Amino acid sequence: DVPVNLYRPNAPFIGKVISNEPLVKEGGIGIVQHIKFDLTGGNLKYIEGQSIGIIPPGVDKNGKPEKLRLYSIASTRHGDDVDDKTISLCVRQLEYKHPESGETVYGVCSTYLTHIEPGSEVKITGPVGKEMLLPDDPEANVIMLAGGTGITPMRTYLWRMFKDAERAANPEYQFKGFSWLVFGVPTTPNILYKEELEEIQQKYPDNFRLTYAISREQKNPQGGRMYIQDRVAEHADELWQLIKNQKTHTYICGPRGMEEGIDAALSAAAAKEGVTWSDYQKDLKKAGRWHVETS
């Protein structure tokens, strides 16, 4: 049922870049690109919450061919144009400190992707992943806790739920539940897909809540920069109340180490009703209602 490994690294699908557009507005930190690829000529199918591999050119420092890097799929199964012909990614250019042999270091695959030109051919593998899948139940509640490019799978869910063209293409999925995105980025220019997220909240105010944690523009009650963990703490009681519903799913995506402050906040909330969150959460994971993808 769920598509997986239609293409593998030994015989990847050769896609073509259609577009490569910037998502970080002026005044933002770093580069994050929305890249769309042409899937025509092959049979790559996928669903929301999955990833694909990209094999970049070149050799590593030891002379060995570069291996694939995984990227969360940014588009619904139908692609951004709802034509079942494309797939999109949301790729940050990795760049980091001097300490590691040199000065500014640039990631191999992410630099390749963020600078790729339309018309270029790329090696694609996958799709992969069954741990970030969206329920078919149109009355589910969906909590989405995203940091940075952790937004990516959330885009696939929200587009499927709320885009006019998606609703028209998906007669069996007319979302009537409640979804809540808490999205942590450093600046307003760094709010990936800001305009479309706010368009969704305006059209569906009873079915979608949008909460930002903007670290360079907002301070938590303790005086520190505002992070996703601070917003979860601020709304811990209400998030816990939603989580108790048998039909609620929670999705967490972003940098590794983001889970710890989220668990601390929810643990304090659940403890007020005599529940140990770590135990309750284990049961949610087993039931397929607690979805995590961090790296």
Ligand X SMILES: Cc1cc2nc3c(=O)[nH]c(=O)nc-3n(C[C@H](O)[C@H](O)[C@H](O)COP(=O)(O)OP(=O)(O)OC[C@H]3O[C@@H](n4cnc5c(N)ncnc54)[C@H](O)[C@@H]3O)c2cc1C
Sites of contact with ligand X (CB under 6 A): 51, 69-72, 90-92, 94, 96-97, 100, 107-110, 149, 152, 293, 295
CB of 21 to ligand X, least distance (A): 15
- Measured from the CB atom, is 70 or 242 closer to ligand X? 70
CB of 68 to ligand X, least distance (A): 9
Residue keyed to tokens 């409640």: 178
CB of 13 to ligand X, least distance (A): 18
Residue 58 CA from chain centroid, whole number? 27
Using Cβ positions, the residue closest to ligand X within the complex turns out to be 107
In this structure, what token pair is assigned to residue 220?
Answer: 């938590």
- Measured from the CB atom, is 42 or 107 closer to ligand X? 107
DSSP structure string for 64-78: PBPPPEEEEB-S-TT
Laid out side by side, the sheet with 32-38 consists of: 69-72, 51-55, 121-128, 13-22, 32-38, 86-92
- Measured from the CB atom, is 130 or 272 closer to ligand X? 130
> Residues 48, 90, 68, 104: is their CA dihedral positive or negative?
negative
The SS3 assignment for 204 reads coil
Angle at the Cα of 6 from the Cα atoms of 80 and 73, rounded to 5 degrees: 30
- Measured from the CB atom, is 91 or 236 closer to ligand X? 91
- Which ranges of the chain does DSSP label H, i.e. alpha helix? 108-114, 151-162, 164-169, 194-203, 228-234, 236-243, 259-271, 277-287
CB of 233 to ligand X, least distance (A): 26
CB of 78 to ligand X, least distance (A): 19
Residues ≥6 apart with Cβ < 8 Å to 240: 266, 269, 270
Q: Find out whether 2 and 133 touch, Cβ atoms under 8 Å.
A: yes
CB of 123 to ligand X, least distance (A): 14
Helices 259-271 + 277-287 axis angle, to 10: 110
- Measured from the CB atom, is 90 or 133 closer to ligand X? 90
- Measured from the CB atom, is 112 or 277 closer to ligand X? 112
- Measured from the CB atom, is 18 or 52 closer to ligand X? 52
CB of 177 to ligand X, least distance (A): 25
